[PDB]
C-alpha cells in the first residue's frame, strides 16, 4: 500500500497529550489500527477500525479519522512503556495484496 | 493461549529457512489468520503473508518474495514460514501472529486483530 | 444492507440421479464407458455429513444394472423347450447323478433321436413313480414353470468391477470415518468423481472378495434390535477359502433343433467325488470369536450363539457360490457351530452340492441352465464379510443368511452418497448496485476463494443405455441453461459476484454483517434463509431488473 | 481461433487465402455458422441434436467467459508470446492460411484459453468494478 506518517518522533509533558498521525495515500474506509510497541516486544494492539479501544488497553488511547488522515491521541500520557506507536492497514483479495504498517513514532515524556 | 516461535539460526547467505510458529494451548479455527511480519530496526512490521485455518489458502506478498516465500500449514496447531533464499532476514526479525479480518462479501477482507504474537527471531546469514 | 448474488456457492442437496456406468479402461462391457475413474479425491476439512447406507439409491441402482446386464447376456441363447419331456432315468453305474434318456428333436422336425445325459438329482423332479433300483421316470425341474435358457458359450461369469461416476453438477461424497456404522454423521468426508470398482460378486451367507475394513470388525444394521434385519459384518482380515469340484465331467453336444444344441454332462472319468470347500480353521475360529465380542458390545449381558443354519431349504440354507460359471450350494452348518461367552491339516471341510438350474436373483421363471464345464474347476477366494440374522433365553442366536442381493452391494456402497451442487445463492453485503474445496470454512473465506474456484463448475459445461446417456446429457443442459437464464434476467453477467438493487430483509435474517460472514458456512446460510429463495428471486427479476432498465433507458427515447 | 494483432483491449469459402484476407471476409461470413443453430434411428437423431447443442453451448460459454460477446472480433488483454510464434505481423497475416496457423500454434490452445479465462477476464472485472463499491 501507499502510506506515510508524521512525525518521526513525539514528546509531551507527563500527564499531557501526544498526537501521532497516520497519513495514507490510499482512501481507507475506517479499516486501520493502532499499535504500541515496547522495546523487545511485538506491538500490542491499541485501537480497531481507527477508533475502537481494544480490550486490555486504557482509555488513554483514543483516536479517529477518515479517508487518508487518521490520528492517535494519547491523553494523561506516561512514557513508562517507552513505546513506538504505529499505524496498521491491510486488505486481502485474490488479485492483489494490499498491506503495510508505518515506521511509527517514538514517545518520550516528562 | 500464546504463540511460540523457533527455528532461526545463522545460515549461509541465500540459504533456506523453516520457522515454526506454535499454538500453545490452542488450535487454529475459523477466521484464524496465521500471519508473519518483518521488523527492521527503526521501522515497523512489514507484511510477509498469512494462511487460513480451515482451508488451504495461503496469501503472501509475492511483490516482496515471489519465488522466495511459502507459508505452509502443518499441524492444526502450527505454521511454517518457508524461505528459499535469505538476505534481509539478517536485518529484520520475524514474528508470527494470530489475527482476524472482517470480510466485505465482495471477494476480500480487511485486517482487524493481531491478538497473539510469538516472541520472534532474527535469522541472519554469513 | 443489500442482496448480493453469488455464483459458485459450495453447497449441495441430497439428490438421486442416474450415475454413469464406467468400466475398466483396460477391458456386459458394451453398455459402460471404459474410461479412467480418475479418483481425484479431495478431503473436505471440517465437514460433517449424514450418511445412510440403508437408504442409498446407488444400491438400488446397482441392483437394477447388475440384473439388466446379466439378462442381456442370455438374450441370444437357446431356450431348452425340447428338453421338457419325460425322462427315463437310471442310476449311474460309473448317488446324486442319474443317467437319463430323452427323445430329442433332430435338425429335421419330423425325426426324433434317443439320447442321454447325466443330471444332478437336485435338478430332477420325479413323476408319479418310485425308485425301483433300476429305473424310474422324471421331469426336469421347472418344466412346469419356464423354458429355462442355456447359458451361451462365452457368457462371462467374471465379476468385472463397475465404477459409478457422477454427472456434471453432482458429486459423490465418500465417508472416511473409520468405524462409521452406516448411519448418522460422518466427521471425515471427501469427494470423488467416481467410486472404487465394485465387483458384482454374488453370494449368500459369506461375502466374498470385497474390501476389508481398515480398522476393527464393523457390524452394521439398519436396526440392531430388529430381528428381521440383516446384519452385515465387515471383516478387517480376509479368511482363505478355496472351493473345488474334482469329478472330471465330459461335455457332450446334443442337437435339439434346427441350428441349436444342448450341452450335456456325461462320461465321468472313473471316480465319483463330492464337491467341497477348504476353509482355514484357525482363521475361521478367530474370526468368529472376534465377531462374537463385537456383537457382545451391541448385545451385552447375553450369550452369543453362532449356531444354526436357516432350517433346510437349499436355496436359503446353503452358501450360494459361483466358480467359473459353476454353481455351488455349500453346507456351512459346520462353520456356524459355536458360541461366545465374554466372561468365560487344521482346516474345515464344507461338503457342497452342485446344481445346474439356477433361479437367479430370486426371480421366478427367469431360469438359467448352466452347461457342464470341463477341466480343473477350482476357485480360490477371500471371505471378507458375513451376513448374519439375529433370531427369551438370554442368548442371541445367529444364523448366516441372505438372498437379498442388495446386501452384497450395501457392503461396498455404504461409503458413498450422491449430492447435487447448487451454485447459486445470495447473502447481504453493504454495497448497493475442487469446486467444493471451500466447504467447512466460513462464507467470508469462501467468497474470497470463489473468485477463482467458481470457475471449476465450468468444467461441467445400447437400448436403454442410450437413453440413460441422453437423459443425462439433456438434464445437464437443462440445468445449465436455467442457471444462465436466471443470471441473465437478474442482470448478473460476470456472475461470480453480482450486486443488486434489492434491499436486505431483517425478516430473512437479523444477524449482523460479521455474524453472518464470519460465523457461518455456506450450507448453514442456505438453510437459514432457504425458504426465502423464491422471494428473493421475484424481487430481483420482476422488480429490480425491470425497473432499473425501464427508468433509465426508455427515457432516452 | 486466435492470432496476434497490435491492439490491446459458404462458411469455408475463405479457405486457401491468407488469414488476413479471410479476416476481412469473416466480418460477414462468420455469420453463416449461425445457420447451424424408428428405434435406433430416433436415437441417432437425438444424439445428433444433443451434440449440436452441446458444441454450440460450449463455444458460447467460452466466448462469454473471455468477454467476447460481439464475437466475430474480440481483442483481449493477453500479450502475445514469441514462444508460441516468433513470426512478424505481416509474416503471419499475409503468408499463412488459417489452417496453417492453427497447426503452428495448435498446442498452445489450452495455454491461451487459461490466460484469457482465469486471468485477464477476471482481473479486468475485479480491478475495475469491485472498487466501485
Ligand atoms: C470447524 O467447525 C467449527 C464449528 O463450530 C469451528 O468452530 C469455531 O471456532 C472458532 C474458534 O474457536 C469460534 O470462535 C470463537 O468464539 C468464541 C465465542 O464468542 C462469543 O463470546 C465472545 C466474548 O467477548 C463474543 O465477543 C462473541 O460475539 C461471542 O458472543 C470466542 O470467545 C473466541 O475468541 C477467543 O479467541 C480469539 C482469537 O483471536 C481471541 O482474540 C479472543 O479474545 C478469545 O480468546 C472465538 O471467537 C467460532 O465461533 C466457532 N464456530 C462455531 C459455529 O462455533 C472450527 O473453528 C472449525 N475449524 C476449522 C479449522 O475451521
Ligand atoms: C475372488 O477373486 C479370485 C481372483 O480373481 C477369483 O478366482 C479366479 O476366477 C477366475 C475366473 O473368474 C479364474 O480365471 C480362470 O483361470 C483359468 C486358469 O488359467 C491358467 O492360465 C493362466 C494364463 O496366464 C494362468 O495365469 C493361470 O495360473 C492358469 O495357469 C482359465 O483357464 C480360465 O479361462 C476361461 O476364461 C477365459 C476368458 O477370456 C477364456 O478365454 C478361456 O477359454 C476360459 O473360458 C480363467 O481365466 C482365476 O484363475 C481364478 N483364480 C483363482 C486363484 O482361483 C475368485 O473366483 C473370486 N471369487 C469369486 C467368488 O468369484
Ligand atoms: C481386526 O479386528 C480385531 C478386533 O478388534 C483386532 O483384534 C485385536 O488383535 C490384537 C492383536 O493383534 C489384540 O491385542 C492382544 O490380544 C491378546 C489376547 O489374549 C491380549 O492378551 C493382549 O494383551 C492384547 O490385548 C486385541 O485384543 C484384539 N482385539 C480384540 C477386540 O480382540 C485385529 O487385530 C484386527 N486386525 C487388523 C488387521 O487390524
Ligand atoms: C511464405 O512461406 C513460404 C513457405 O516457407 C515455409 O514456411 C515458412 C514459415 C518457413 O518455415 C520456411 O522455412 C518454410 O519453407 C516461404 O517460402 C520459403 O522461402 C525460403 C527463403 O529462403 C526458402 O528457403 C524456402 O524453401 C521457401 N519454401 C518453399 C516451400 O518454397 C515464403 O518466402 C514466405 N513468404 C514470405 C513473404 O515470407
Ligand atoms: C449312461 O447310460 C448310457 C446308456 O443308457 C451308457 O452308455 C452305454 O454304455 C454301454 C456299455 O457297454 C454301451 O454298450 C452303450 O453303447 C452305451 N451307449 C448307449 C447309448 O447305450 C452310459 O455309459 C451311462 N453313463 C455313465 C456315466 O455310466
Ligand atoms: C422315444 O420314442 C419311442 C417310440 O418308439 C419310445 O419307445 C416306445 O414306448 C412305448 C410306450 O408305451 C412302448 O410301448 C414301446 O414298446 C416303446 N418302443 C420301443 C422300441 O422301446 C421311447 O420310450 C421314447 N423315449 C423316451 C425317453 O420316452
Ligand atoms: C413344479 O413342480 C414342483 C415340484 O413338484 C412344485 O413344487 C412343489 O409344490 C408342492 C405343493 O404343495 C410342495 O408340497 C412341494 O414341496 C414343492 N416342491 C418343492 C421341491 O418345493 C412346483 O410348485 C411346481 N410348479 C408349478 C408351476 O406347478
Ligand atoms: C465418526 O468418527 C467419530 C470419531 O472419529 C466417532 O465419534 C464417537 O462418537 C461416539 C458417540 O457417543 C462417542 O461416544 C465416541 O467417544 C466418539 N469417538 C471419538 C474417538 O471421539 C463417530 O461416532 C463416528 N460416526 C459414527 C456413526 O460412528
Ligand atoms: C450408529 O451410531 C449412531 C451414533 O452413535 C447411533 O445412533 C445413536 O443411537 C443412540 C441410542 O440411544 C441415540 O441416543 C443417539 O442420538 C443416536 N445418534 C444418532 C446420530 O443417530 C446408531 O444407532 C448406530 N447405528 C447402529 C446400527 O448401531
Ligand atoms: C480423514 O480422511 C482422510 C482421507 O482418507 C485421511 O487422509 C489420509 O491419511 C492417510 C494417513 O497417512 C494418508 O496416507 C492418505 O494419503 C490420506 N488421504 C488423503 C486423500 O489425503 C485423514 O487422515 C482422515 N482423518 C482422520 C482423523 O481419520
Ligand atoms: C427397531 O425396530 C423395532 C420395531 O421394528 C423398534 O421397536 C418397537 O418400535 C415400536 C414403534 O412404535 C414400539 O411400539 C415397540 O414397543 C418397539 N419394541 C420394543 C421392544 O420396544 C425398535 O425401537 C427399533 N430400534 C431402533 C434402534 O430403531
Ligand atoms: C448340512 O450338514 C449337516 C451335517 O451333516 C446336516 O445335518 C444332518 O442331517 C442329517 C439328516 O438325517 C442328520 O441325520 C444329522 O444328524 C444331521 N447332523 C447334525 C450334526 O445334526 C444338514 O442337514 C445339512 N444341511 C443341508 C441344507 O444340507
Ligand atoms: C458342533 O460342535 C459340537 C461340539 O461343540 C459337535 O459335537 C461333538 O463332536 C465330537 C466329535 O468327536 C464328539 O466327541 C462330541 O461328543 C460331540 N458333542 C456332542 C454334544 O455330541 C458337533 O458335531 C458340531 N456340529 C457340526 C455341524 O460341526
Ligand atoms: C448355544 O450353543 C450351545 C452349544 O455351542 C448350546 O449348548 C447345548 O445345550 C443343550 C442344553 O441341554 C445341550 O443338551 C447340548 O448338548 C449343548 N450343546 C453341546 C454341543 O453340548 C446352547 O443350548 C445354545 N443356546 C441356545 C439358547 O440355543
Ligand atoms: C484341502 O485340499 C487338500 C488337498 O488339495 C486336502 O488334503 C487331503 O486331505 C486328506 C484327508 O485325509 C488326505 O488324506 C490327503 O492326503 C490330503 N491331500 C494331500 C495332497 O495331502 C484337504 O483335506 C482339503 N481340506 C478340506 C477342508 O477338505
Ligand atoms: C428292478 O429290479 C427289481 C428286482 O426284483 C425288479 O423287481 C423290478 O421290476 C426292476 N424294475 C425295473 C424297472 O426293471
Ligand atoms: C486375499 O487376501 C490376500 C491377503 O494378502 C490378498 O493378497 C489377496 O489379493 C486377496 N484376494 C482377493 C481375491 O482379494
Ligand atoms: C457374565 O456377566 C453377566 C452379567 O449379567 C452374567 O449374567 C454372566 O453369567 C456372566 N458370565 C460368566 C461366564 O460369568
Ligand atoms: C480327466 O481325465 C483325463 C484323462 O486323460 C485327464 O487328462 C484330465 O486332466 C482329467 N481332468 C481332470 C479335471 O482331472
Ligand atoms: C487344479 O489346480 C490345482 C492348483 O494347484 C492343482 O493342485 C490340481 O492338481 C489341479 N487339478 C487338475 C486336475 O489339474
Ligand atoms: C421484508 O418483508 C416484509 C414482509 O411483509 C416486507 O413488508 C418488507 O418490505 C420487507 N423488507 C425488505 C427489505 O424487503
Ligand atoms: C423452512 O421451512 C421449514 C419447515 O419445517 C422450517 O423448519 C425452516 O426453518 C424454514 N426456513 C426458513 C428460512 O424459514
Ligand atoms: C511466454 O511463455 C513463457 C514460458 O515460461 C512465459 O514465462 C512468458 O511470460 C510468456 N510470455 C507471454 C507473453 O505470455
Ligand atoms: C504439437 O505437438 C506435435 C507432436 O508431434 C508437434 O509435432 C507439433 O509441432 C506441436 N505443435 C506446437 C505448436 O508445438
Amino acid at each position: 500500500i501507499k502510506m506515510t506518517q508524521t512525525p518521526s518522533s513525539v514528546s509531551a509533558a507527563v500527564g499531557g497529550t501526544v498526537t501521532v498521525n497516520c497519513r495514507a495515500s490510499e482512501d481507507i474506509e475506517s479499516y486501520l489500527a493502532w499499535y504500541q510497541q515496547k522495546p523487545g516486544q511485538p506491538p500490542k494492539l491499541l485501537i480497531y477500525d481507527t477508533s475502537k479501544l481494544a480490550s486490555g488497553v486504557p482509555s488513554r488511547f483514543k483516536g479517529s479519522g477518515s479517508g487518508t488522515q487518521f490520528a492517535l491521541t494519547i491523553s494523561g500520557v506516561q512514557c513508562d512503556d517507552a513505546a513506538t506507536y504505529y499505524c496498521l492497514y491491510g486488505y486481502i483479495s485474490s488479485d492483489r495484496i494490499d498491506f503495510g504498517f508505518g515506521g511509527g513514532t517514538e514517545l518520550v515524556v516528562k | 493461549q500464546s504463540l511460540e516461535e523457533s527455528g532461526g539460526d545463522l545460515v549461509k547467505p541465500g540459504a533456506s529457512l523453516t520457522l515454526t510458529c506454535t499454538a500453545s494451548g490452542f488450535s487454529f479455527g475459523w477466521n484464524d489468520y496465521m500471519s508473519w511480519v518483518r521488523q527492521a530496526p527503526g521501522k515497523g512490521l512489514e507484511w510477509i503473508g498469512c494462511i487460513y485455518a480451515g482451508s488451504t489458502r495461503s496469501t503472501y506478498y509475492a511483490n516482496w518474495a515471489k519465488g522466495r516465500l511459502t507459508i505452509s500449514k502443518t499441524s492444526s496447531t502450527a505454521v511454517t514460514l518457508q524461505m528459499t533464499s535469505l538476505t534481509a532476514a539478517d536485518t529484520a526479525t520475524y514474528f508470527c501472529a494470530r489475527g482476524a479480518v472482517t470480510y466485505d462479501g465482495l471477494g476480500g477482507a480487511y485486517l482487524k486483530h493481531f491478538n497473539l504474537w510469538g516472541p520472534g527471531t532474527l535469522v541472519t546469514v554469513s | 444492507l443489500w442482496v448480493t448474488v453469488y455464483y459458485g456457492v459450495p453447497v449441495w442437496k441430497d439428490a438421486e440421479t442416474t450415475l454413469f456406468c464406467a468400466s475398466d479402461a483396460k477391458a456386459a462391457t458394451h453398455a459402460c464407458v471404459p474410461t479412467d475413474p480418475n479418483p481425484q479425491e479431495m478431503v473436505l476439512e471440517n465437514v460433517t455429513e449424514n450418511f445412510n447406507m440403508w437408504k442409498n439409491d446407488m444400491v438400488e441402482q446397482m441392483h437394477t444394472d447388475v440384473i439388466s446386464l446379466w439378462d442381456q447376456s442370455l438374450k441370444p441363447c437357446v431356450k431348452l423347450t425340447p428338453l421338457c419331456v419325460t425322462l427315463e432315468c437310471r442310476q449311474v453305474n460309473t448317488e446324486e447323478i442319474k443317467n437319463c434318456s430323452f427323445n430329442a428333436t433332430t435338425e429335421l422336425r419330423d425325426k426324433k433321436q434317443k439320447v442321454y445325459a447325466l443330471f444332478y438329482r437336485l435338478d430332477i423332479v420325479p413323476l408319479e413313480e418310485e425308485r425301483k433300483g433300476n429305473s424310474s421316470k422324471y421331469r426336469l425341474i421347472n418344466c412346469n414353470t419356464s423354458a429355462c435358457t442355456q447359458a451361451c458359450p462365452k457368457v462371462t461369469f467374471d465379476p468385472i468391477p463397475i465404477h459409478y461416476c457422477a454427472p456434471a453438477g453432482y458429486a459423490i461424497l465418500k465417508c472416511n470415518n473409520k468405524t462409521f456404522n452406516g448411519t448418522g454423521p460422518c466427521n471425515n468426508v471427501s469427494t470423488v468423481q467416481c467410486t472404487h470398482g465394485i465387483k458384482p460378486v454374488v453370494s449368500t451367507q459369506l461375502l466374498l472378495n470385497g474390501s476389508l475394513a481398515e480398522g476393527e470388525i464393523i457390524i452394521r444394521s439398519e436396526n440392531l434390535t430388529n430381528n428381521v434385519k440383516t446384519i452385515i459384518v465387515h471383516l478387517n482380515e480376509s479368511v482363505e477359502i478355496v472351493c473345488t469340484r474334482p469329478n472330471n465331467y465330459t461335455r457332450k453336444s446334443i442337437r435339439i433343433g434346427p441350428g441349436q444344441t444342448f450341452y450335456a454332462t456325461g462320461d465321468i472319468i472313473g471316480n465319483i467325488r463330492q464337491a467341497y470347500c477348504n476353509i482355514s480353521k484357525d482363521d475361521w475360529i478367530r474370526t468368529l470369536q472376534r465377531v462374537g465380542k463385537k456383537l457382545a458390545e451391541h448385545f451385552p449381558r447375553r450369550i452369543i450363539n453362532f449356531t444354526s443354519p436357516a432350517g433346510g431349504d437349499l436355496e436359503i440354507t446353503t452358501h450360494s457360490f459361483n466358480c467359473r460359471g459353476e454353481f455351488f450350494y455349500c453346507n456351512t452348518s459346520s462353520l456356524f457351530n459355536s458360541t461366545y461367552n465374554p466372561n468365560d491339516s487344521l482346516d474345515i471341510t464344507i461338503p457342497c452340492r452342485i446344481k445346474q438350474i439356477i433361479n437367479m436373483w430370486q426371480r421366478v421363471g427367469q431360469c438359467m441352465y448352466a452347461p457342464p464345464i470341463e477341466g480343473n474347476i477350482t476357485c480360490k477366494s477371500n471371505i471378507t464379510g458375513l451376513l448374519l440374522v439375529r433370531d427369551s433365553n438370554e442368548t442371541e442366536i445367529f444364523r448366516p443368511g441372505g438372498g437379498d442381493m442388495r446386501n452384497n452391494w450395501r457392503s461396498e456402497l455404504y461409503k458413498y452418497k450422491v449430492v447435487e451442487i447448487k451454485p447459486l445463492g445470495i447473502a447481504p453485503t453493504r454495497c448497493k448496485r475442487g469446486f467444493l474445496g471451500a466447504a467447512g470454512s466460513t462464507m467470508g473465506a469462501a467468497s474470497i476463494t470463489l473468485t477463482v474456484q467458481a470457475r471449476q463448475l465450468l468444467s461441467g459445461i445400447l437400448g436403454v443405455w442410450g437413453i440413460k446417456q441422453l437423459q443425462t446429457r439433456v438434464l445437464a443442459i437443462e440445468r445449465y441453461l436455467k442457471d444462465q437464464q436466471l443470471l441473465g434476467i437478474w442482470g448478473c453477467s460476470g456472475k461470480l459476484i453480482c450486486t443488486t438493487a434489492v434491499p436486505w430483509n431483517s425478516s430473512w435474517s437479523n444477524k449482523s454483517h460479521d455474524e453472518i460472514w464470519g460465523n457461518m458456512t455456506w450450507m448453514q446460510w442456505d438453510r437459514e434463509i432457504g425458504n426465502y429463495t423464491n422471494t428473493i428471486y421475484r424481487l430481483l427479476e420482476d422488480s429490480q431488473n425491470q425497473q432499473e432498465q425501464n427508468e433509465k433507458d426508455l427515457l432516452a427515447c
Side-chain angles (χ1 to χ4, degrees), chain C residues 76-331:
Chain C
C77 301
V78 175
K79 293 175 70 171
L80 301 173
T81 60
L83 299 178
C84 290
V85 299
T86 304
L87 293 92
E88 179 182 352
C89 304
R90 302 195 69 188
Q91 171 65 50
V92 172
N93 64 337
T94 296
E95 295 181 356
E96 297 182 57
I97 307 300
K98 305 294 183 181
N99 203 328
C100 301
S101 295
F102 301 86
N103 284 359
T105 297
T106 59
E107 296 83 353
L108 300 177
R109 292 181 66 191
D110 59 355
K111 297 290 185 182
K112 300 290 185 288
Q113 55 177 354
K114 186 176 181 179
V115 300
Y116 68 93
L118 305 180
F119 297 91
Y120 296 88
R121 178 63 180 81
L122 292 172
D123 294 321
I124 304 297
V125 178
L127 306 180
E128 298 79 5
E129 185 59 282
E130 298 293 324
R131 180 180 179 273
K132 295 176 180 174
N134 18 43
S135 67
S136 62
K137 295 179 177 179
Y138 302 85
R139 181 173 72 250
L140 297 175
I141 194 165
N142 299 339
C143 285
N144 61 5
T145 300
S146 178
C148 188
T149 298
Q150 179 171 248
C152 293
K154 307 297 184 183
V155 172
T156 177
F157 296 92
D158 186 349
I160 296 168
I162 184 166
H163 295 258
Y164 289 96
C165 300
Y170 294 86
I172 299 168
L173 274 61
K174 182 166 73 174
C175 178
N176 289 316
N177 189 25
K178 294 179 185 178
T179 78
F180 178 75
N181 64 11
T183 64
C186 180
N187 64 343
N188 190 351
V189 301
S190 66
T191 62
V192 299
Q193 189 66 44
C194 302
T195 67
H196 66 288
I198 299 171
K199 294 180 181 178
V201 177
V202 177
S203 71
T204 61
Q205 297 188 355
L206 304 174
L207 301 173
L208 307 178
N209 287 10
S211 176
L212 295 174
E214 296 82 0
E216 70 276 28
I217 296 171
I218 307 302
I219 300 174
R220 300 191 175 97
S221 177
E222 185 174 356
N223 175 344
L224 290 170
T225 61
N226 186 322
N227 63 308
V228 175
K229 300 294 188 179
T230 299
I231 299 167
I232 301 172
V233 180
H234 298 253
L235 302 176
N236 53 347
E237 298 183 8
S238 61
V239 178
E240 180 177 352
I241 180 168
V242 57
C243 300
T244 186
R245 180 175 55 68
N247 60 10
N248 214 350
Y249 292 128
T250 301
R251 177 180 288 182
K252 295 183 186 286
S253 177
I254 299 171
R255 185 84 69 196
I256 61 168
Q260 54 183 28
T261 61
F262 168 70
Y263 296 108
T265 301
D267 306 332
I268 297 168
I269 309 303
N271 288 307
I272 307 301
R273 295 289 184 272
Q274 186 178 53
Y276 68 95
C277 300
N278 228 300
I279 297 170
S280 173
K281 186 172 182 179
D282 288 346
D283 291 292
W284 180 249
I285 293 167
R286 284 191 287 268
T287 298
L288 291 178
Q289 290 293 300
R290 291 170 178 187
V291 173
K293 182 173 170 65
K294 294 297 285 174
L295 287 168
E297 290 176 346
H298 291 294
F299 303 98
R301 302 184 68 196
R302 295 289 185 274
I303 302 302
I304 295 169
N305 264 33
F306 296 107
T307 60
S308 181
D313 182 337
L314 186 67
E315 289 293 329
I316 63 169
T317 304
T318 58
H319 183 194
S320 174
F321 173 78
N322 185 284
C323 178
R324 296 173 58 179
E326 182 60 278
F327 292 86
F328 289 64
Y329 296 81
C330 296
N331 186 330

Side-chain angles (χ1 to χ4, degrees), chain B residues 89-109:
Chain B
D90 64 1
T91 299
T93 63
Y94 294 92
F95 295 88
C96 68
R98 183 184 187 184
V101 303
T102 176
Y103 294 95
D104 59 9
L106 301 174

Side-chain angles (χ1 to χ4, degrees), chain A residues 29 31 92 94, chain C residues 430 448 451-452:
Chain A
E29 296 173 280
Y31 295 111
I92 300 168
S94 66
Chain C
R430 71 191 178 93
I448 296 169
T451 60
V452 177

Side-chain angles (χ1 to χ4, degrees), chain A residues 37 48-49 86 91-92 97, chain B residues 39 43 60 108-109 112-113:
Chain A
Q37 185 176 33
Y48 295 93
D49 303 323
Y86 298 88
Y91 178 74
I92 300 168
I97 300 172
Chain B
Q39 175 69 67
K43 303 293 184 182
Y60 63 88
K112 291 183 84 75
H113 299 254

Side-chain angles (χ1 to χ4, degrees), chain C residues 266-550:
Chain C
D267 306 332
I268 297 168
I269 309 303
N271 288 307
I272 307 301
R273 295 289 184 272
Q274 186 178 53
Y276 68 95
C277 300
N278 228 300
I279 297 170
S280 173
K281 186 172 182 179
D282 288 346
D283 291 292
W284 180 249
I285 293 167
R286 284 191 287 268
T287 298
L288 291 178
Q289 290 293 300
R290 291 170 178 187
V291 173
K293 182 173 170 65
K294 294 297 285 174
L295 287 168
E297 290 176 346
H298 291 294
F299 303 98
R301 302 184 68 196
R302 295 289 185 274
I303 302 302
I304 295 169
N305 264 33
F306 296 107
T307 60
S308 181
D313 182 337
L314 186 67
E315 289 293 329
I316 63 169
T317 304
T318 58
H319 183 194
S320 174
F321 173 78
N322 185 284
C323 178
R324 296 173 58 179
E326 182 60 278
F327 292 86
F328 289 64
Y329 296 81
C330 296
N331 186 330
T332 56
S333 66
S334 68
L335 293 172
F336 293 93
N337 190 42
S338 68
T339 190
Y340 176 83
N341 184 335
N343 28 357
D344 182 340
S345 182
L346 304 177
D347 52 7
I348 301 168
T349 301
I350 305 301
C352 300
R353 308 297 299 277
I354 303 295
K355 184 174 176 177
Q356 294 181 329
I357 299 297
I358 309 300
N359 296 322
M360 193 70 82
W361 311 116
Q362 306 299 304
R363 296 181 299 182
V364 179
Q366 300 297 300
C367 177
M368 179 181 74
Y369 171 78
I373 304 166
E374 295 179 336
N376 199 4
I377 310 304
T378 301
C379 298
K380 180 175 177 175
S381 66
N382 287 19
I383 299 167
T384 59
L386 309 172
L387 300 175
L388 305 178
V389 180
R390 189 171 68 87
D391 186 294
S392 296
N393 294 291
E394 301 182 353
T395 303
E396 298 291 359
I397 298 94
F398 294 88
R399 300 189 169 85
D404 185 342
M405 295 299 103
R406 290 173 181 84
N407 287 334
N408 290 340
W409 297 323
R410 291 186 193 281
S411 68
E412 296 285 319
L413 292 170
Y414 72 94
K415 292 187 175 185
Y416 299 103
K417 184 179 192 186
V418 179
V419 303
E420 183 179 347
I421 297 168
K422 302 293 188 182
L424 295 172
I426 60 93
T429 70
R430 71 191 178 93
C431 180
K432 184 177 186 286
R433 178 177 290 178
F435 175 71
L436 296 176
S441 68
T442 61
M443 291 193 284
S447 73
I448 296 169
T449 299
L450 293 177
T451 60
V452 177
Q453 183 171 306
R455 291 191 299 278
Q456 292 184 35
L457 292 172
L458 300 174
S459 68
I461 60 176
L462 299 173
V464 71
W465 288 98
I467 296 297
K468 288 181 178 185
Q469 291 179 38
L470 288 169
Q471 290 176 337
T472 300
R473 290 187 183 87
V474 172
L475 178 61
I477 292 167
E478 179 180 346
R479 288 187 290 106
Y480 173 77
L481 292 174
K482 288 179 178 175
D483 286 344
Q484 293 292 102
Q485 184 273 339
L486 290 173
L487 290 166
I489 65 173
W490 297 340
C492 297
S493 296
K495 67 178 77 69
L496 267 53
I497 301 173
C498 176
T499 56
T500 76
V502 175
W504 184 256
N505 211 324
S506 69
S507 295
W508 298 336
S509 176
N510 62 334
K511 294 180 176 73
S512 73
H513 181 79
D514 293 291
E515 287 172 333
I516 294 168
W517 284 103
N519 212 52
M520 301 184 76
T521 68
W522 278 106
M523 293 181 77
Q524 290 172 313
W525 177 247
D526 186 68
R527 289 192 294 272
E528 289 294 299
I529 48 68
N531 323 10
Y532 305 116
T533 298
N534 290 337
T535 298
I536 280 66
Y537 293 176
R538 288 192 299 273
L539 292 169
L540 293 170
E541 70 186 301
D542 291 301
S543 180
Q544 292 303 317
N545 286 277
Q546 303 304 319
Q547 184 176 21
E548 288 287 307
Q549 295 183 67
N550 290 342

